[PDB]
Amino acid sequence: HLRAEGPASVLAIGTANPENILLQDEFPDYYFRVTKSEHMTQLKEKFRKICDKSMIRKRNCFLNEEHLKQNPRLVEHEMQTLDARQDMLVVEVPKLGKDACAKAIKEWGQPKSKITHLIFTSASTTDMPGADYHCAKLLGLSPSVKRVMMYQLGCYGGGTVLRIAKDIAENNKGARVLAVCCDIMACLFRGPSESDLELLVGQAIFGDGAAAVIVGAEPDESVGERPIFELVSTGQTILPNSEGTIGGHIREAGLIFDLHKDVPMLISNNIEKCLIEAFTPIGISDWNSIFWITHPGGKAILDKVEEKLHLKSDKFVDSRHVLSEHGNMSSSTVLFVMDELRKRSLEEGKSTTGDGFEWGVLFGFGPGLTVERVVVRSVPIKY
Amino acid sequence: HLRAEGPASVLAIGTANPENILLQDEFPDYYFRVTKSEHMTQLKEKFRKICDKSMIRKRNCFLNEEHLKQNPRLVEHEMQTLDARQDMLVVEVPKLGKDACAKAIKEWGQPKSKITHLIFTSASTTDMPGADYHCAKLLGLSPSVKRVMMYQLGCYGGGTVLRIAKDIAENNKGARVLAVCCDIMACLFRGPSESDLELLVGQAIFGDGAAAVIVGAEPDESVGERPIFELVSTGQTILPNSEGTIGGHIREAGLIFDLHKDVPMLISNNIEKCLIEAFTPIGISDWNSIFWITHPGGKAILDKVEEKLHLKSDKFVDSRHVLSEHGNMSSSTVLFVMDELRKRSLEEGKSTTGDGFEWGVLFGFGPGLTVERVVVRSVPIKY
Ligand SMILES: CC(C)(COP(=O)(O)OP(=O)(O)OC[C@H]1O[C@@H](n2cnc3c(N)ncnc32)[C@H](O)[C@@H]1OP(=O)(O)O)[C@@H](O)C(=O)NCCC(=O)NCCS
Ligand SMILES: CC(C)(COP(=O)(O)OP(=O)(O)OC[C@H]1O[C@@H](n2cnc3c(N)ncnc32)[C@H](O)[C@@H]1OP(=O)(O)O)[C@@H](O)C(=O)NCCC(=O)NCCS
């Protein structure tokens, strides 16, 4: 049985979003108008302060006002609407995922018949056959591509798809793994109630997007393959004292979510143990001596991690950039951060794809409370 | 990192079912009585013929008549009932899965802290955090167990979990993978309509169960590990001219399924291609010279494959026995077949765990139409 030699690497990254944009300056007034909730004057001003403090300036969003006029049940606080949401999302999720995959394939530059495996994750929908089947068909992949469908992971799933891809690519000589994440927030959009600030936090922060990577071991430079990041080691853990703090449920009313106020403190108070476990085998203890690829679940998670570890403000630039332009897109977000990091490193004349550092860490955070961790190495930029 | 040498093997198998039983000879009268549909006299007689031809003698079934009396919306033909089904199934799916896992761990005989990974599949429910999280908590696994949650695969998923486990176990020295499938048909139970035989076929065939395996490379005989089957090679394919023939959708009314009359012919007309691809590299062309571990999706699938390939009656003994005593339990069913094969081989004095044969094939069939294939080797039974 022929296995590969040496580590799996990310060979290409592609991203996509719906064309329609929500400008955050306009969002409190838009949301309270389309939901027929203008009478809630005090709640609207509380919501404006949440949106202003979020550090999100714009979001892409497939759902538009004409969808809401065609089905006004979607603007109610709680109404049976899953079937309408699914009718949209079982089509749009694989379509936007295929758009990200086509951009990754173009960068990679190899024939699409060389793709041996396809991993697909989304928390926005579920169906049989799944988004993996439709994405493969829209791309014209081999019917014998080996698929890994992972519905309903949530915000840690960008780390999960890299962890799954690493073992496949290393155990199978010649394997080339296409891994894609895609979410569309029409699954969870609904109108306000007078007391429910938890619902409003989600309505302010979640946005739409897809991101795809090609992963393989033994890159062949002679045909034009080029590694961007090496995948070194992985971990997945459940934080102590964290039950129920991040949740998401598929219900008759749509996707219903739970977000506890303690989430930023729980991440920040546990993240040093994750780093010690990952980096002691490599001989590293200085968290300012590595690059970071961090899921921006909210501005408070980034601010509290930076403060707890005394990180320099260089580490989170790409996480803050993606947050500002796209909001929280669930699993795909950390892959947008990876793309921005390597692109900015080249634009700024840095020595490696990881802002001039050799070693780095990737983190995703989501339901459990689960932390996905990947130790990564950059590649030199040769000029 | 340190990778393992040699092939991954199944080291232990455990199974579980709800205690409540449906006798098939009584099911036409039970179903039409509890769904308040006795006025459909001609439909009930057609259903009696379907149940008599199904070659299912009994099924285990968590849903009972007292559940139906407490919530009569569950016996309507089509009614908004997903929330009530999920409220039951988010609890009962990880519970029944844990029961199968505990039996596999007892056979294996090693500390549960040696489990490094947990794979979970179910088509009956979906939630965040998932059934994998709850099953790991109920078992008391390490919080750092690496989880692989796969919701909504369907009837091919017993093959899928083996395919995922193989690459994890081979690429990581010391890895021990717990892989579990679990389905509970309360997700799809509903009352009849005057015309709809497709719905009734599913009401006659689907039953409840869970099955778990432990998979690892480099078994250690000195501490009591013993391989049962070696996992040699894997494939996943989509059959030509099969779009739409097997489907399942999560809707306000529950799990809604599609089953086309052409399914048995499509499988039988394509299965030889699958065998030639799997076995030509090994030098094998005689399909009666290997053992078979086949998902019994319905009696007609088995009948048409046997006829097409001129298989001897020995090949489908265990598939037919599991169908008789349990019905179609979705992804877990093929792992019940694997357990029965190795237990019967010991009881009947055969020389290997695969009915005296060296080489074998495992098949799962489900939405796509997708076929999962695994080439396996038996191990000797020696004294
Ligand atoms: C939402 C956020 C951007 C607001 O920033 P901020 O205004 O500087 O922070 P504050 O803590 O002052 O929150 C503003 C208001 O929102 C409320 N709020 C914030 N998070 C909340 C939650 N999870 N549930 C309920 N209310 C919440 C606060 O109680 C406060 O209201 P009050 O002043 O009436 O008490 C910030 O709290 C954040 O980034 N949170 C993390 C979001 C998260 O968990 N993301 C993961 C998604 S899976
Ligand atoms: C259901 C089954 C056990 C019935 O066996 P049988 O009675 O010997 O087979 P028949 O083909 O004569 O079918 C009996 C009746 O069921 C009907 N029927 C069978 N499969 C059907 C389907 N998929 N949709 C609608 N009606 C169906 C037949 O049309 C026939 O009714 P009719 O005489 O009024 O036309 C058999 O057809 C079977 O095993 N089918 C495969 C099930 C399957 O696809 N499983 C995969 C699950 S994902």
mmCIF file of N, CA and C in Angstrom, chain A residues 205-256:
data_model
loop_
_atom_site.group_PDB
_atom_site.id
_atom_site.type_symbol
_atom_site.label_atom_id
_atom_site.label_comp_id
_atom_site.label_asym_id
_atom_site.label_seq_id
_atom_site.Cartn_x
_atom_site.Cartn_y
_atom_site.Cartn_z
ATOM 1 N N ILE A 205 -22.979 39.848 13.877
ATOM 2 C CA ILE A 205 -21.630 39.383 13.574
ATOM 3 C C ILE A 205 -21.534 38.362 12.423
ATOM 4 N N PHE A 206 -22.604 37.559 12.140
ATOM 5 C CA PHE A 206 -22.407 36.476 11.178
ATOM 6 C C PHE A 206 -22.584 36.941 9.715
ATOM 7 N N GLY A 207 -21.638 36.537 8.862
ATOM 8 C CA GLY A 207 -21.630 36.890 7.454
ATOM 9 C C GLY A 207 -21.384 35.647 6.569
ATOM 10 N N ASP A 208 -21.396 35.862 5.240
ATOM 11 C CA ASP A 208 -21.389 34.712 4.296
ATOM 12 C C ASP A 208 -20.062 34.557 3.576
ATOM 13 N N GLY A 209 -19.646 33.315 3.304
ATOM 14 C CA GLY A 209 -18.453 33.074 2.548
ATOM 15 C C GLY A 209 -18.140 31.592 2.369
ATOM 16 N N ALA A 210 -17.223 31.306 1.433
ATOM 17 C CA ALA A 210 -16.629 29.952 1.225
ATOM 18 C C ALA A 210 -15.141 30.061 0.993
ATOM 19 N N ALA A 211 -14.400 29.038 1.431
ATOM 20 C CA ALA A 211 -12.962 29.000 1.209
ATOM 21 C C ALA A 211 -12.566 27.546 0.935
ATOM 22 N N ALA A 212 -11.649 27.356 -0.008
ATOM 23 C CA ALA A 212 -11.157 26.023 -0.397
ATOM 24 C C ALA A 212 -9.618 25.992 -0.414
ATOM 25 N N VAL A 213 -9.036 24.832 -0.037
ATOM 26 C CA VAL A 213 -7.616 24.597 -0.155
ATOM 27 C C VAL A 213 -7.370 23.281 -0.936
ATOM 28 N N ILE A 214 -6.202 23.200 -1.602
ATOM 29 C CA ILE A 214 -5.656 21.916 -2.098
ATOM 30 C C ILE A 214 -4.542 21.513 -1.148
ATOM 31 N N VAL A 215 -4.580 20.271 -0.626
ATOM 32 C CA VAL A 215 -3.582 19.738 0.289
ATOM 33 C C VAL A 215 -2.916 18.489 -0.363
ATOM 34 N N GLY A 216 -1.589 18.427 -0.299
ATOM 35 C CA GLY A 216 -0.866 17.229 -0.789
ATOM 36 C C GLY A 216 0.506 17.104 -0.173
ATOM 37 N N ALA A 217 0.978 15.854 -0.072
ATOM 38 C CA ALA A 217 2.379 15.592 0.234
ATOM 39 C C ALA A 217 3.221 15.460 -1.054
ATOM 40 N N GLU A 218 4.542 15.564 -0.928
ATOM 41 C CA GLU A 218 5.510 15.456 -2.083
ATOM 42 C C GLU A 218 5.138 16.383 -3.249
ATOM 43 N N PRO A 219 5.083 17.695 -3.002
ATOM 44 C CA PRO A 219 4.801 18.637 -4.110
ATOM 45 C C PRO A 219 5.798 18.480 -5.245
ATOM 46 N N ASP A 220 5.313 18.575 -6.488
ATOM 47 C CA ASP A 220 6.163 18.407 -7.687
ATOM 48 C C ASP A 220 6.396 19.768 -8.351
ATOM 49 N N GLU A 221 7.538 20.361 -8.043
ATOM 50 C CA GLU A 221 7.850 21.706 -8.554
ATOM 51 C C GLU A 221 7.952 21.748 -10.081
ATOM 52 N N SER A 222 8.320 20.621 -10.692
ATOM 53 C CA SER A 222 8.504 20.595 -12.140
ATOM 54 C C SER A 222 7.242 20.773 -12.963
ATOM 55 N N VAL A 223 6.078 20.482 -12.379
ATOM 56 C CA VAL A 223 4.808 20.701 -13.011
ATOM 57 C C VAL A 223 4.120 21.968 -12.497
ATOM 58 N N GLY A 224 4.794 22.720 -11.620
ATOM 59 C CA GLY A 224 4.284 24.000 -11.145
ATOM 60 C C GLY A 224 3.549 23.969 -9.790
ATOM 61 N N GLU A 225 3.623 22.888 -9.010
ATOM 62 C CA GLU A 225 3.094 22.881 -7.620
ATOM 63 C C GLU A 225 4.072 23.658 -6.725
ATOM 64 N N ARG A 226 3.509 24.381 -5.756
ATOM 65 C CA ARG A 226 4.284 25.264 -4.853
ATOM 66 C C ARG A 226 3.594 25.212 -3.453
ATOM 67 N N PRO A 227 4.287 24.676 -2.412
ATOM 68 C CA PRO A 227 3.727 24.769 -1.051
ATOM 69 C C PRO A 227 3.658 26.178 -0.493
ATOM 70 N N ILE A 228 2.633 26.414 0.321
ATOM 71 C CA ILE A 228 2.417 27.714 1.002
ATOM 72 C C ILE A 228 2.646 27.562 2.527
ATOM 73 N N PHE A 229 2.048 26.532 3.134
ATOM 74 C CA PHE A 229 2.210 26.225 4.559
ATOM 75 C C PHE A 229 2.314 24.691 4.691
ATOM 76 N N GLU A 230 3.203 24.209 5.553
ATOM 77 C CA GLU A 230 3.280 22.775 5.939
ATOM 78 C C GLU A 230 2.430 22.495 7.153
ATOM 79 N N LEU A 231 1.679 21.386 7.118
ATOM 80 C CA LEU A 231 0.870 20.961 8.243
ATOM 81 C C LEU A 231 1.661 19.994 9.147
ATOM 82 N N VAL A 232 2.085 20.434 10.336
ATOM 83 C CA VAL A 232 3.054 19.710 11.167
ATOM 84 C C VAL A 232 2.399 18.768 12.177
ATOM 85 N N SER A 233 1.447 19.285 12.981
ATOM 86 C CA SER A 233 0.794 18.453 14.023
ATOM 87 C C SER A 233 -0.576 19.018 14.315
ATOM 88 N N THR A 234 -1.466 18.182 14.853
ATOM 89 C CA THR A 234 -2.825 18.588 15.132
ATOM 90 C C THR A 234 -3.293 18.199 16.519
ATOM 91 N N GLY A 235 -4.286 18.934 17.025
ATOM 92 C CA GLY A 235 -5.000 18.585 18.263
ATOM 93 C C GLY A 235 -6.444 19.057 18.178
ATOM 94 N N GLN A 236 -7.325 18.338 18.871
ATOM 95 C CA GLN A 236 -8.703 18.781 19.098
ATOM 96 C C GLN A 236 -8.992 18.543 20.606
ATOM 97 N N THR A 237 -9.506 19.546 21.321
ATOM 98 C CA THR A 237 -9.839 19.338 22.724
ATOM 99 C C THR A 237 -11.127 20.082 23.127
ATOM 100 N N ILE A 238 -11.760 19.538 24.154
ATOM 101 C CA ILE A 238 -12.922 20.123 24.826
ATOM 102 C C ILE A 238 -12.450 20.868 26.071
ATOM 103 N N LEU A 239 -12.713 22.211 26.130
ATOM 104 C CA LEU A 239 -12.259 23.000 27.302
ATOM 105 C C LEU A 239 -12.999 22.604 28.591
ATOM 106 N N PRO A 240 -12.310 22.630 29.727
ATOM 107 C CA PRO A 240 -12.986 22.397 30.982
ATOM 108 C C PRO A 240 -14.028 23.504 31.311
ATOM 109 N N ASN A 241 -15.057 23.147 32.043
ATOM 110 C CA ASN A 241 -16.019 24.104 32.563
ATOM 111 C C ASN A 241 -16.704 24.930 31.469
ATOM 112 N N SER A 242 -16.990 24.321 30.308
ATOM 113 C CA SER A 242 -17.411 25.078 29.108
ATOM 114 C C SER A 242 -18.712 24.465 28.468
ATOM 115 N N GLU A 243 -19.406 23.533 29.183
ATOM 116 C CA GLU A 243 -20.570 22.881 28.571
ATOM 117 C C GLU A 243 -21.648 23.887 28.216
ATOM 118 N N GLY A 244 -22.234 23.725 27.003
ATOM 119 C CA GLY A 244 -23.376 24.510 26.610
ATOM 120 C C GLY A 244 -23.062 25.946 26.164
ATOM 121 N N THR A 245 -21.799 26.400 26.186
ATOM 122 C CA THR A 245 -21.477 27.804 25.974
ATOM 123 C C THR A 245 -21.533 28.227 24.519
ATOM 124 N N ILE A 246 -21.349 27.290 23.560
ATOM 125 C CA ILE A 246 -21.536 27.543 22.130
ATOM 126 C C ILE A 246 -22.364 26.417 21.550
ATOM 127 N N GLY A 247 -23.538 26.723 21.024
ATOM 128 C CA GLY A 247 -24.454 25.645 20.477
ATOM 129 C C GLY A 247 -25.192 26.131 19.268
ATOM 130 N N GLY A 248 -25.721 25.179 18.514
ATOM 131 C CA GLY A 248 -26.520 25.488 17.334
ATOM 132 C C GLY A 248 -27.407 24.321 16.994
ATOM 133 N N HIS A 249 -28.698 24.562 16.826
ATOM 134 C CA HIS A 249 -29.717 23.497 16.768
ATOM 135 C C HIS A 249 -30.579 23.644 15.505
ATOM 136 N N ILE A 250 -30.805 22.551 14.793
ATOM 137 C CA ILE A 250 -31.662 22.534 13.591
ATOM 138 C C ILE A 250 -33.059 22.245 14.011
ATOM 139 N N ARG A 251 -33.920 23.261 13.929
ATOM 140 C CA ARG A 251 -35.272 23.285 14.436
ATOM 141 C C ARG A 251 -36.281 23.693 13.330
ATOM 142 N N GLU A 252 -37.553 23.552 13.628
ATOM 143 C CA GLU A 252 -38.595 23.972 12.696
ATOM 144 C C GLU A 252 -38.468 25.520 12.370
ATOM 145 N N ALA A 253 -37.993 26.310 13.327
ATOM 146 C CA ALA A 253 -37.815 27.763 13.159
ATOM 147 C C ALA A 253 -36.526 28.151 12.465
ATOM 148 N N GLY A 254 -35.703 27.201 12.040
ATOM 149 C CA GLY A 254 -34.395 27.445 11.472
ATOM 150 C C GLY A 254 -33.249 27.014 12.357
ATOM 151 N N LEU A 255 -32.079 27.599 12.169
ATOM 152 C CA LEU A 255 -30.895 27.363 13.021
ATOM 153 C C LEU A 255 -30.979 28.295 14.240
ATOM 154 N N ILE A 256 -31.116 27.722 15.420
ATOM 155 C CA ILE A 256 -31.225 28.410 16.685
ATOM 156 C C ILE A 256 -29.915 28.268 17.436
#
